[PDB]
Amino acid sequence: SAPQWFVPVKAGDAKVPAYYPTDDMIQEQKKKLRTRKGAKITALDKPAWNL
Amino acid sequence: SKDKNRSSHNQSHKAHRNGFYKPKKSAYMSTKGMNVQVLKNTKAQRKFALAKKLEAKKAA
Amino acid sequence: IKPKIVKKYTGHFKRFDSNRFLRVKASWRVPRGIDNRLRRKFKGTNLLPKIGYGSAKATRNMLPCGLYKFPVRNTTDLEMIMMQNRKYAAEISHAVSAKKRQEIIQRAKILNIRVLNADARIKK
Amino acid sequence: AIDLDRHHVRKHVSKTARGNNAYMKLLVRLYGFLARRTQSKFAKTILHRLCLSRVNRPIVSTSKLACLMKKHPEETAVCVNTVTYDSRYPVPKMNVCALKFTKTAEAAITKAGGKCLRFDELALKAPTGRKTVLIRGKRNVREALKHFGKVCAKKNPAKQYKGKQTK
Amino acid sequence: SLRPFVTIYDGITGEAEKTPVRLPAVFLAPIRGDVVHFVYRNQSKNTRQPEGVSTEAGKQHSAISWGTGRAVARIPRISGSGSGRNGQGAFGNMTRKGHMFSPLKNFRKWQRKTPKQMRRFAVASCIAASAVPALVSARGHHIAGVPQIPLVVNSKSISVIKKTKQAVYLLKKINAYSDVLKVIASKTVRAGQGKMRGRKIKERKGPLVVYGNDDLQAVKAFRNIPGVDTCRVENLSVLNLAPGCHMGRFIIWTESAFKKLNTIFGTQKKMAQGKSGFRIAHAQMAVPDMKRVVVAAEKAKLLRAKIVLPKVPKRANPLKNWA
Amino acid sequence: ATRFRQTRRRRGHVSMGYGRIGKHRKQRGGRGNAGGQHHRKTWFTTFHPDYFGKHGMRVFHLKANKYYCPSINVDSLWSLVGKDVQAQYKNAKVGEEVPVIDCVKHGYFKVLGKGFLPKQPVIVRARYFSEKAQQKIKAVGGACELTA
Amino acid sequence: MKFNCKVSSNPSKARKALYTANASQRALMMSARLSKELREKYNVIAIPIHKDDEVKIIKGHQKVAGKVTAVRRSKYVINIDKLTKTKANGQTVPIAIRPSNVIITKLFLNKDREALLAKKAESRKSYKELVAKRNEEVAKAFTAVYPALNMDIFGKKVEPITEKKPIRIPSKKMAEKLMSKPTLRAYKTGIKVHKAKNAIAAYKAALAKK
Amino acid sequence: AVSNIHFCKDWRSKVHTWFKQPFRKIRRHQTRVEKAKAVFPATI
RNA sequence: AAAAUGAAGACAUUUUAACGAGUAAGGAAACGAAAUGGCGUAAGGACAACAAAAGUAGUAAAGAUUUAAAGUAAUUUAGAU
RNA sequence: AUAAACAUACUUUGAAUCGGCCAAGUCUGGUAAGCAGGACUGGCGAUGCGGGAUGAACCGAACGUCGAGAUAAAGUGCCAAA
RNA sequence: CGAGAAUAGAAACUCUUGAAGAAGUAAAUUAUCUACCCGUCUUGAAACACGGACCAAGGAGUCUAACAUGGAUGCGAAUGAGAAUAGCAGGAAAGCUAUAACAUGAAGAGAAAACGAAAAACUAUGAGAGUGUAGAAAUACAUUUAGCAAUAGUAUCUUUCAA
């Protein structure tokens, strides 16, 4: 398995080391930023705790 | 050029920085100059007791 | 994530009388005079470097981007921080040619390392 | 401020092996760990004596070990210092643990049927210390101590560093 | 003392000999870096040449101070007139074209003494470190491919080496050419005023070929190879086995030199023959390992359990805090 | 090592660790042992209280070779031949061969009596002997020999 | 290394003897190499240059071929009729060329170059027969110890010993405790960097197989 | 300790330094060898 | 200062508590829980792309002028000319 | 009774210093002195900060870098916070 | 009414501004508060005390020798013998080796002649090692044993008119 710190990226045919995989087996992952969950939706009748 | 002769100012403060060094207990237990006859009796007994103690040591 | 880097004094500790005489440089020197206005810590002139001015141990020597500087001279020197790309930032030395700079700049993109000299010695 | 009698200054006790000896560093590592875990005053003592300076760790000869081990037949003398050889007197059979053994002292102890141990073996065999006798050499036998003080003193005169026209 | 075996290789064919050789007892001496530093710090100064400024440099004037009452300082001044030199500064240390501070004399102390038994202690400790692959590589040697870190070659293969093409061939067979090429590829030029005095090239250090008394004709072949230095087994010193005070030099022993080691240095129980009066020292620790003591103490149920410091709670105000 | 001196640590201090009131001047009371009886008399009284005067008779030309007499105590006699020989002749007595300790051949002329001898007969050969030296050698069952 | 104690390895003394050398030693210094056609005819590598020779410039801006028109030994340079520059007002001046940037393609041999070339040729042959006698003597010793091998092995490829016999020595545990902090930290970082490189290589191989 | 140092004269002109010592050995050894070659039983 | 942990992490570890003014003067180097911690000048011996071409350099060194960044500070780092 | 284990006892080696000055519910010589000389303690020297307009010593109080509050000497018509 | 305890219950949010330049930082100017000339001798200097017009480069605790303390190192009744000097490989101001004169020490006192050390020691307090009980987390007591270093005091012995 890949190490937690290894996120392979594609190389534009530029020089690569021996250990770096060739881009045909490298699949990009979309950059992720958000990590918090939005507010839950509750009943129209019940009030929010933050009242 | 007359100078100040002497002052005791700050002398006591200096003496108490490292306080009055009391003598050790060994100073109070010296025996030089004691009574002549008292020392003779003490030497006689210490010689007598040592010889007896050594004699047992050689015996055993 | 990035901690709040707090500096206790953002100015410079200039030498005494450096503003008045051009032979006295601005590099700090503690005044050792017997009547010095500064070493006696007068009002107005009482600004001296002290250990209390030091910044927090957590954020010391940390660049504003939130990473620690790491000088590299070639592409191999980048591999020493490829495991810590979230802590260290590369820094191409001032004597590295423009040809070797492209290899360093390209390789760091492969290894996902932030380079602070990415805009150095660029051609016309 | 606060009226303290005196301010905080470093406590004048050594707590590591002086110098860059790799093996003495490990021995302090071993006994600092043993004293911290076992909480034995023997390991605390050995650790403290391992961190003294060379002048404060005086030698103990085989004659002194023989006399102190006379009524301790099956015991392991433990002295944290170099053990020299007293060629004037014979060496009986005994087990000694010491930092270093003189070439002649090791042969004399071995040839008599005894054993020469190191401190790592002693910790392996007797970590808390059960059949051991703690021994240290004499400190006042140094010749430097003769010249300390005032040679004009009426009670305990010094000994007059020799020099120009000393009679 | 089981003293594990050491294999001897053929330099030409690459074939290990059928008769192993026991490791000499000199490879188990304590590796004291502080003792080596004391000896190397002294011995490195023994090659220095005497130097000194001219005894009469800056004192070749008949100058005297002008004195006070002339609005000029009291430093002595050159006598006469008619040139720019007259009336200028004089012998004084701060003046131009005068003598300096306390001038350097050619009878200074150049060479340093060192006791013989301390010098022999350092060589034994430096030989021991040459058999530790971790210390050898950490010094800057490429020993990844060599078969045995106490590298020994046959005395038969050594006797046939007469040209530098053969010595290079042997160095390739025993996988020792990685260090030679590291020196070749990394040769450069000195940075500073050392080039004026003649010191221009600055090369690295490579393998050291230690040979015996029967390999005096193979020395000529190895000498021209860049980054290869040869030494006789008897003439070893800290200047060879720890250049720059970094112990752990990569050494290529020969069969004649490897076997003479036991006679030259002796064992930890036998006095040396080649170096009279010297015996290998015993380390402060019989087994320089702490794990075996901890587990035995653990097995005897003596050590307490590991302690994690409790989290000391922060101070609260009971009058204002109900909890 | 000039970089470990105190001059490198006192750079920036004006007086270089010698005082402002009392400067570092050329002399501090004279050159050499000057003023041995005038102002450094408290020094000589305190630390060398017999420096000035005369004692004993002069030897116009001392023959230092006539006083040469290395000494060895009785307890150290057996170390001249070693412990291997000492144990080998351990069970000897009058009548058979007993080792001879040549003190002179080892550079020792006089034999003194200090400490205790091992309980074995021995023949001690030396130039001079002490009263207690001969007593201890003879009380163990041995003999004393003269030389030169 | 240099083992003759008469000659000096001092750069400053070497340059001084170059500037102050007389005309006799300046001629033997400004030598040029013969071309292939001339080398094959005479079996001589290089000879001191001479006027009216024809040379061919091999290094510089213009690799023209001309005739030697001036052998200036004070400046240590030569002149060619084909390499000139116009001196602004119109007259052309020759361009100085170092003799080590040209090769001779046509000699000017009157009577003593012929004697020199014969002497230069025989010296080459005489040394060759001496080197041959040494190499045979060196080879005769090699076949006495390794009768099954021939001396051509030294010119071909070399196969390293792949056997990896390890040795047990009771100091490898202490290795980490015998380095100073600067060399311990570098040693540990090299281990960490090497391990991570192997981790990436292992991951790549798994992807390649799959 | 009372010091007794005799540096009150011009010791700088009295200093003798041994920089020729490593070449006395080569001189004496070579001459010693030269004697053996000339007539061997003279260096005998 | 005391407890805990400790072959290598790292920020010269973790926690708790007390303390921090200063002329003359002292605290040399080394010492894993380190018997004060560091910056700079020049030269000498090593190390510097670990897989057989192994620190930087005419794709622009040293130096000089400035703009910014790191450090309480000595100073260091980088950009532009 | 109270305090005291980073308590206590020190040993060795050594630096600088022995021109001092001020105060006072103190003294001596003097008409007197911001004079000369002493006993006890505290300070200035070596010392900045708040107050006395200003000041080597007076009053409060002694200083790592900052935030928030309660204060000390002393003040609250304006300069000047009250 | 109600402590302990047993049994069940519940906290995840909004708005504004920011590559049309947020927060921070820097430079210049302005405004409130604030700031006497550095070095030095001195009880006391911003002083109507002296040196200093400005800038660059140079500029001052060093070297040799004897002793002592002290921290790291080797060996240890020995240590050193890189005393001269003599050999070895290599070509070498480097390196290696030399049963060795001597230096310091192992014996001390006396001006010197003449001498030259045990009762195989004693007493005191002191480092360490166990067992049992209990608190009960660590730890606190009872008891058995050894008594090193250090200090002090004793006998005994060598030398001195005198220790």
Side-chain angles (χ1 to χ4, degrees), chain E residues 4-5 7 9-10 12 14 28 31 131 133-135 144 147-148 156-157 160 163 166 169 172-173 175 288, chain G residues 3 135 138 145-146 149 151 153-154 158-161 163-165 167-170 172-175 178-179:
Chain E
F5 279 117
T7 302
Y9 291 96
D10 214 331
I12 312 298
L28 320 159
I31 313 161
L135 289 183
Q148 287 196 181
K156 149 181 193 133
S157 73
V160 316
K163 297 197 88 99
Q166 321 194 298
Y169 175 79
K172 284 151 165 173
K173 213 95 199 197
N175 254 315
Chain G
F3 293 116
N135 278 353
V138 175
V145 190
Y146 289 91
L149 308 163
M151 264 274 206
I153 56 163
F154 297 114
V158 194
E159 274 313 310
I161 293 165
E163 154 192 339
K164 207 99 183 220
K165 272 195 170 126
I167 302 300
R168 205 95 65 75
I169 285 185
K172 298 172 165 38
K173 329 161 304 303
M174 261 285 168
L178 294 163
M179 297 171 237

Side-chain angles (χ1 to χ4, degrees), chain B residues 55-60:
Chain B
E55 195 30 32
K57 228 185 58 189
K58 275 76 171 164

